[model samples]
Target: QSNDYRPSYHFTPDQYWMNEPNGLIKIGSTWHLFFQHNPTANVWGNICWGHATSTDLMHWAHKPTAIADENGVEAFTGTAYYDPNNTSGLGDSANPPYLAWFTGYTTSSQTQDQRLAFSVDNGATWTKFQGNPIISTSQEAPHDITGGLESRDPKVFFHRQSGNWIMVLAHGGQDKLSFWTSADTINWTWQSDLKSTSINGLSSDITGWEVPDMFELPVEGTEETTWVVMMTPAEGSPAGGNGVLAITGSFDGKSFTADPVDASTMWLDNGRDFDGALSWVNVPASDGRRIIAAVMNSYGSNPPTTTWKGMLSFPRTLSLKKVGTQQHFVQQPITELDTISTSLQILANQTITPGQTLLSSIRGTALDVRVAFYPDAGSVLSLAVRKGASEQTVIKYTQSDATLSVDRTESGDISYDPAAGGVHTAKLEEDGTGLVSIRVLVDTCSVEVFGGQGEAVISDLIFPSDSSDGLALEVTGGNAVLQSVDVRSVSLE
Candidate 1:
C-alpha cells in the first residue's frame, strides 16, 4: 500500500470490449492479470486475453496481447493457478515450469469447452494441453441448456484439507453452482450442484450464473473458523437477484452449502445505487494476505466518446468483517496510492468569495485532489480546469437539492447537459468535518472523478491536446475556505 494507486489508462481503439478480469495468478515475485479483451476493433469481437503485469499492485506495466485465438478459437474467461507438480499433464517439468487453465471456443467446433494451455518461462509463452478436452460436454448433457457454450469462468483453487484441486463452473445443468473436483490439475469430474432451487440461498432460475468466484475469508473476531466460499453472481433467478452477490457458508470436500437459512451475504459495492453502472466484477489478484484486488467495469454505450472509449473501474480492496449476526463485505480504494504523491498543497482558514479562483502550482492529467471546507453563506462550490479551448466546470454541493453538477460544455467531446448531468454538487452533511475528497484520473480525452463520500461520480470522454496544461480551482456563488488541497502528478509508464 505504499504506491500511488490510480485507475488504468483509458483503452485506445485496438483494445476494446473489456468485460471482466480473468487468469489472476501470482507466480514468483510478479503477478499476472488477464482481462476479457477483443483486440480487433472497438467492439466485442475477436475475444482474446489482454495481459498486464506488476511486481507491486500500485503501478502496472502493460505488455502486448498475450493469449489470443491462435487456432481460430475465441478465448474467454478463466483462472490461472500454480501447477508445479504438472498433475494436469499439460506441460513437462524439464521446461520453464507453470500451467494455465481457461475456457475457450473453437470456430469449427461451434461449442464452448474448457481448454488447457501452459507456460514454463514464467508465463512468457504457452503450449496447449495434450489432454485437450479434460472434461467433455456429454457428462452433464441432461441440463438441456441453451447456447451450449460448454460453461465458462472456471475458478481453480487448492483445498488444504481436501488435498485436491477444486473448480467452480457456471455450470447450469441443473441451474445452480456446479461443483467439480479434480485430483490433478488437468482432469476434472462433475461432483454435484452446490446450491440450487431446493437449497437455502436464492434460487437459480434466470439466464443461469456466470463468472462463479469461490474463496474463503475469516470471520473477523473469531480465531475458531478459517474461511468461506465467496461467489460472484453473474446470473440468478428472479427471487435470487443478481449483480456481484456472495454468500458465506461451508463447502465440504465435494460440494458447498450455505448456512441453513442463507445467513450471510452482501454486494461488492455500496449496493444502494450505481450497481448497474458497475458490472463484470472480477478479483484481479490475491495472495495469502488479507487483501484482494477487483476491477469494477464501466458501462459502455453509444456516447460521444464512443469514437475512442472503454476503461476499468478503479481497482478496489476487498475484505470481510463481522457486523453482527452476519459478516459484511467492505471495499475501499487501495491504500498504496498514498506513496505516488509528487506534490502536496494545504490551505487553512482562507475563504474564496464569489468570482474568485484558487489556482495550484502543479497541473497534469493524473491527479488526486482533496478538499475540506465549511460554507456558511450559499450552496455552490465550483472547481474548474482550463487549458487552451478545453475547460471542465464542476458545481459541487448545490443549494437547491444537494445534487452535484458539472458544466462540461467546455469539456470538448465528452460533454453532458448540466441540468441532468451525473455530477452532483458537494454539500455539508451532519458529520463534524466538512472535508470532501475527489480523486481525479485524467487522460488525454477522458476524465474520471471518484467522490470520497460516495455522494456523486462524474465520468466523461474529453479531448485535450498535450499543449493544453492549465488547471485552476474556483469558488463561485457563495464563499468557502480552501481548507487543504493536495495535487500529485502521476508518473509516466
Candidate 2:
C-alpha cells in the first residue's frame, strides 16, 4: 500500500497521486485522464494508472485504477489516441475503443520497453497486449544506449493517409527521436531516427530530445501541411534538462524539419507551477480544437501536505491566434470548471485594505481564488496567506522591480530554494490595480497563480505536511480592497 502522506495537488480536493497525465484521450462525450500514480504508497511508489473522467475537462470523476502494474513492471510515460481502424479493438463497437501505448520497466529489465495497453470499456478496465513487451531495448541499436535505459516516452498517433500508426520514442539520449511503424497495434517495426534541424534560429547542438510530441497543423486557407515537434531540450550530448523546446516546420511523414529560427515558444508553467519545484510537461492530442495537459513535478523529499503531492495542470485549449502577422499559442481554462463553483463575486472597480483577510472561513484543499489588484498597490501591496502560527504563503508585488513573486518561506521545506527552484519572479504589469488581479487555483498539492489575467502565471506543486488544509488570506501595506473576487469549492466529480 502507498503511504498516507502524498504531494498536495495529486489528491485534488478528494483524489490521489496525480502526476504526468497519460492517455489524455477524448472519446465520445468524455475526456479521460490517466495519470502517473503508485497505488501502493501515499508517496510515489508502485507506479500505476490512476483514472478519472470529465465531460468538461474541469470537474473530474475519480474512478478505480484503469490500468496497473499487475506484472510488477513499472508503467512509465506514454500517450493515447483514437485508432479508427479497430486495429486494437480497444474502444467500443459503435466507436472503436481507445488505444493506450506506454513505456514499461522492471527490475530484471534495466532497459525501458514500449508496451501496448488498451481499454474498450471507456477506460474502466484495461487489457495488456498478449505479445507483451511489444517493443524492447533489444530492438534499439546497441550504439544508442550509453549505460542508461534507452527507448522510453512513446507517443502514438495515426497516419491519416496511410491508415497506419506512427510511434516516436527517445533513442538512447542521442538527442534523436526514433520512429516506428505498426500495421496492427501488436507488431511495431523501428523505422529511423530524426533530430531538430535548429532551435530559436540557433544550431541544433542539444543532446537528447526528451518527450517528443508530433502533430500536424493546417496552413491557413490552403491544403498545405505544417508539423510541430514539442520536446524538452537537454544540454549534454545525452539527456540534459534545459526546459521545453517547441519546433515547427515541415515533416515528411518519417522526418521533421524545424523552423530555422527557434520556433515560437513559451516557458512551461512560468517555471513555478509546483511547490516541490520540479517540472512536469505533456504533449497534446487534439480533436477539432487542440488541447494540452501538463504535470507539476513532485520532486521534493518532504511528505505531502494533504495526503498526496503532484498534479496535472488544468486541461487547457491551445490555439495559434494571430497578433499582427505572428501566431502565438493562447491558453484558456476549460469551461467545465464553472460547475465546481458555489459562488462568484465580480469586483470590477473596488479595492481591499492591506490588513483585510479575505475568505478567512473558507479552508479546504480545492479552492479557486481570483483577485485582481490595481496598479497603485505596486510594491507595497501583497497577498499573505497564513496557515497557522508558523505557516504562510505570500504573493508579493514589487513596483520597482516590475516583478511578482510567490513566497512560500513559511512552508519549511529545505528543498524550496528560489535561486535554483521555487516560485520566485515573473514579468508583471499593473494595469492601475485592475491588472493586478491574481487568479489562484489551489488543489491539494498544487497551486496555480495567474497574474495579469493569466498573462503571467505561476504554477507550483507544494507538499506541506504541517496542516492538511489551513488557509487564511491577508493583504499588506496597500489600501486596496478586493474589487471583485471569485472563490469556488472544487470536487472530484
Candidate 3:
C-alpha cells in the first residue's frame, strides 16, 4: 500500500535509495544514466553507481550496477565522456574509450579523491584504472581557508577552444568550484578556483557547493554559444536547502566568467525537487540541444517509506531566452513524453466570475495541462488538483501581486510527514499583456508547475488518496478570461 505514491512515468529504482544523476552520456543511439544508489536499504549508505539505459529519454530499463562500493570505499557523483581521440590511452585507437571520473570516498579515513574507470563495450562493463586516484586532493592546493581534501563531484568535458579535457570539481568544505585541465585525461593540473564569493550577490546562506556540471548551449535562434556551469549548494535554496544554481557565462579553457547581468541571479529550475541536476555529456553537436535530469526529492525532506525511496524528475530540455532584458533559464518537458499521451482535451475562451468554477470535469492523477488566461487586476486563479471534496493541492496565481504559489495545507494524506504541507511561491514574469501561461505536469505523487513558459517553476510532492482524482479551476475577486486550456491524459504503462 505504501508503494501507491510511486510515480508512473518518472524513473525510479526497483528498490532502495537513489540521489544525484551521475555519469550521464549518450553512446550510439542509447542514453546511459548512472546515479548514486544504496542497494541494501531505503537510506543513504553503501553508495555505488546504479546504471540504466533508454533509447528515448522517457522510458528506462535498469541494468546491473555499473560501479559498486568495495572495502569501505563508496563511489560518489561524477560525469562520463567519450574519448574518441584515445586521450586517456586506456583504449587503443581502434576501441576509443568511454571514461568515467568519479569521487571515491573512504568512510574510515574520511578521505575523498578523484578516480577513473574505463569501459570499452559501451558501458556494459567497467574496469577501474590500474593507477587509480588519478587526481588526489592531497596533491592539490588549498581553497579559501581550507585544504582541498573535501573535493568531490568531478565533471569532465572536452573544451573545444583549448582542445583539452576540463574537469570542474566542487570543494565541499570551502564553498568553491575548482578547474583542472588534462591533455591525456590521466595527468591533471589545477588551473583555477571559482570561489563562491566571486559570484556577485550570491546567496550568503550557501554554506558549500557540490555536484558541479559544465556544458555549452547555443543561444536560442542564434549561432552564438553560451556555457552553463551548474552548482548545487549544501544549504540555502529558495525551495529549501540543497538547491541547484546555474551560471551562464563563457569558459576560456581555464576559467569561467559569468555574464554580469546573470551573475546576480540564479537561473536554474527554481523548485524544491529539482536538485543535483546534470546535463548529458557527449551529445552530438549536430543535435544542438541541452537536456537535464535531477533528483525529484528535496534533501531537507523525507520521502514516504517505500521499497524505493527516490525518483528522478522528468527530463527537461533547457534553453536560454531573453526575459526583461536578461537571459533566463527556460525549461520544457522533453518532446518524447508527448508520444505517450492520449485523450487530448481543449477548452478555449471561457470566462469565470468571482467565486465560480470554470473547469469542473477535468480530472486525472497523471496529466499534462497547458493553460493560458488573462486575469483582471486584483484577480486570483486557483487550480485544485488531485482533489476530493475535502482535500486538494491548490496552485494559485494572483494577478495583483504577480505571484504564483502552491498551497498544500489541505492536500490529502500528509499526516505521515509534517514538513510536507506549506505554501511555496514564486514571483511570476508577466508579459506586457495580462496573459499568463502555465504548464503543469502531474504524476501520482508529484506536481510540477511551469509558469510563464518555465521562467518560474515550482515542484511539490503530494500524497493524495488513490481515489482523489478531481481537478477544478476557480477565479476569485474578479472575472478571469481563460484564453485557452489544453489537458491531455498521460499513460505510463
Candidate 4:
C-alpha cells in the first residue's frame, strides 16, 4: 500500500487497469465515475465498467463493477444520461432511470456497436435493454464514407432547444465525428459528420479521433455561451502524444459549426498524460457547473509497474473566456479539493532576485500552491518541486514570451518510459495589470498546473524519489516582485 509513486490525492483504484472516464454523472449527492476497466490483469483486456463515487470530488470510495462483459462482448467507453420524466420508458413513476450508452465490442469479429443500459436504482445497478446494439454498422453503413467501420465512444446529451437526445460518436480511423439523434435513449438516426479536414495550428497527422465530447460553457464574466467539442487524436497529439484537442463553436443539436476565430486547433492540456476526457452529465441546474476528468496517462506509453495501473486527473470545472476574439476553454481545479487541506502557509511581497530562492520553509511532494506575481519584462519565474541536488521538476514561466513550461527531463526515474521525460510548454496570458497567476497541485507522482485562471494547463507525471520533497521559488534573468503566495498541504484521506 505504500508504493512511492502512488498518487496521494488523485483518484487511483486499489488495483488492476483503468482508462477513459466513462459514464460520469452526479446522482443525488454523490458523483459517480465509471471507467474502462480490466478486472483480470494490470494491462488492457476483459473490459468492464469499473465504478467509484465521491461526495467532495477528492476522496473516492470504490464500488462494485456497474457493467460487465456478456456473451463474448466487451463493455467499452460511453456516457450516462439521467431521464427525469421517464422519457425512455425504462423508468416509471417510482424511479426515473439513469441511462448509459456504450459501445459493445466483439474481439473475434473486431466489430463495435452501440448499446443501451439503464439503472433505476440510482446508478447502483444496471440492466441491459432487451433490444441491444441500438446502432449497428449495418444501420450506419450508408453514411460510413471513410470505410473506417470503427464507431465507438458515444457521448450523449439532451439538447434542450431541439428537445431530443444527441450522440456524438468517434469514427475511429476516419478522423471524423458522427452525430446521431434519438427521440428516446434508443433508436438512433444518423444526422451529420464532421471530418478533420485541416487544423490551422495543429498537426493533421492525426490517424483518427477517439473519445469525442461536446458541451456548452458560459463565458466567464459574461452572459454568452459557447459549445466545445473535445477529441483525442489516435496517432498522437501536438503536446507529443495522446492528449485532448478542442474546438469552440455553435451547436444546434444536429451539427457543430466552429467559430472562425477559433478555427485553429486548441489543446485541452499541454501535457502528454491527460487524455480520454469527458465532462459530467446531468449536473443539476442548481449546480450550474461543467466539470471534466480524464485518464492521467497516455495510450501505449510505458506505465509504472504496479498492482494498480491507472489514475485520473483531478476534476476540473470548465469555463470559457474571450481571449483576443476567440473563445478559449479554461479549466480550474474543483474548489472542493480545498476540503483536504490540513495546513496553510502564506508568503507575500517577497522580491526575488536572480538565483535567489524564496519561501524555503515550504516543502512537500503533496501540496497545493497558489501564486501571483509581477515579473520584470524579461524575467523568468521558476517553481521547483521535489528538489534534490541532482534532480528537480521545474515549472517555469517566461514573462518575455508569455509561456509556461514544465521540465522533467532531470526529475528522476524517467527510464520507465522514453515519453515520460520532456519539457512541455503552454501559452500563458497576463492580466491587464501584467500579473500572472498560477495554481499547482503536486501529488506523489504527478503535477498539474493552472495558469492565469486555467487559461493554460499542463499535467504531467514524475517519479522523483520519495525523499526529494523540497520546494522553492526562484527568479532568473531579472528581478520580479512576488505579489502573494499560498501553500496548502493536501491529503488522500
Best by TM-score: 3
Task: Determine which window of 10 residues in candidate 3 has minimal summed lDDT.
Answer: 140-149
Candidate 3 lDDT tens digits, 1-493 = 3455878888888777888899999998999999998887645477999999998887889999898888788999999999998988899888999999999888787678889999999888988888878986665545423444588899998887899899998887588888999999889988998876787766667767899988887777667878888878878777667777787787899998876434224746555677898888777778757888888777322666467767888888788887666667878888888898875578789887876775577678888888899988898889888888888988999988889898888888777566578888887856767689888898888888888867787877787876677888888888888898888888755
Model 1, runs deviating above 4 Å:
1-18, 42-44, 58-65, 90-97, 108-110, 171-176, 194-208, 218-247, 258-265, 269-309, 321-328, 348-362, 372-438, 445-483
Per-candidate TM-score against the hidden true structure: 0.70, 0.76, 0.95, 0.94
Model 3 pairs in collision: none
Clashes of 4: 0
For all candidates, the clash counts are 19, 58, 0, 0
Q: What lDDT does model 2 reach?
A: 0.59
Model 1, span 387-458: residue lDDT tens: 544455453555445444445555543342222123322222312465544555555544545444433344
lDDT digits (tens) for residues 409-478 of candidate 4:
9887888887888899888877878789988888888899988868788998888887777887899899
lDDT of each: 0.54, 0.59, 0.82, 0.83
What local lDDT score does residue 290 receive in model 3, on the 0 to 100 scale? 87
Best by lDDT: 4
Candidate 1 Cα lDDT to native: 0.54
Comparison by TM-score, 3 against 4, better one: 3
What C-alpha lDDT does candidate 3 achieve relative to the native structure? 0.82
Evaluated at residue 447, the lDDT of candidate 1 is 50
